Symmetry: C3
Subunit: 138 residues, 3 copies
Amino acid sequence: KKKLSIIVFSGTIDKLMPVGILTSGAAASGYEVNLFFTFWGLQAITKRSLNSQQPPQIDKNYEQMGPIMMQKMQEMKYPMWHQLVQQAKEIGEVKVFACSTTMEFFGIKREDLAEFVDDVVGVATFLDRAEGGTTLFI
Amino acid sequence: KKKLSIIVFSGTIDKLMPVGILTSGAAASGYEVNLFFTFWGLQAITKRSLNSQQPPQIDKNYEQMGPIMMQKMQEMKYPMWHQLVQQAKEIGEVKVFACSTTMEFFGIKREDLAEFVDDVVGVATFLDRAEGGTTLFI
Amino acid sequence: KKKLSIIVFSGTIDKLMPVGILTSGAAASGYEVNLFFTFWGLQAITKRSLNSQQPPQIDKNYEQMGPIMMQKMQEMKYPMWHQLVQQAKEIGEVKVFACSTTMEFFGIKREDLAEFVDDVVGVATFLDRAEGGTTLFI
Ligand SMILES: [Cl-]
């Protein structure tokens, strides 16, 4: 069985969209997908971040291009990255993991995380799950 | 035959150079190389971007170090990233793909893309092509 | 024979920490680990950069969150990324490589590199070592 594992390190919207798109497409294709949220990505899956009214953060390197993208996505009614992940779970085999080390660094507790997080694990556990499939660091 | 596949997400010069160097080095070593330009990387392979007279953009995180690099490369007459890719295509087995989803988000049409793009494809296509080789997200 | 290879392109502290954490965890789990420092990551392993008194650089995209992280790490007495890598070498099979191309671009000589660098090699040499294992670009 085909497998895709992604270490979701980044927390800007322009990087979270690819995560959602890859996850959704891979799940639809019948892949096993493993997501490992760490550092800024882990911050992005906290309930506080997900419910924030503040406008999503685009990478400062491409600020000038931000509105074009945001405007064209809302125009297409394109789902948000987290909705893509949750829908993928319903359609295929998708597991969402939170990095335990980052949680200590940012003082994040399990209860602070989105309901769709399946487990809190360390690095080695993710390496073992990623073994043999395609693996990306985003 | 060894294979390298790269998702070229970034569009800053400091990230596009590695793409060129990896492609060139791998192709010369006998690797099959697949490049998938998406988001900012897709912007970078539009004819408009390639022909722009505006100075390449370094990652804002390393601005202070930008000139040192730019100066030392023009001093060595080091080829531009896209020249390295095109030369790699002539030397080895290199395929350049453009992401169809990003093209919709940024209103880019096939005619707007550089001639060296072989095809416009979606995510699953690139997963399929990458399967079994080394795969990187840049 | 489980193996992890990482192309360490980035030079900000928030990206170097994951490199140390991945290396340390992988080595402790019995993985062979290969690190290839290139571009800004290569700069980060020069003796000058390692001995610098200047405060580590966080990604400008997450400046606001920098102090929280630094403060919580020094509070836990969390080792620095390079200490995690050197400790991993002592514990397991970890090899550190420097990118020969970027060394020309930045005018870095072998003597300028940290003693823990095992060899200076080109990109195809490192791809050959990475083949068959999990490979990441950070
Ligand atoms: Cl990667």
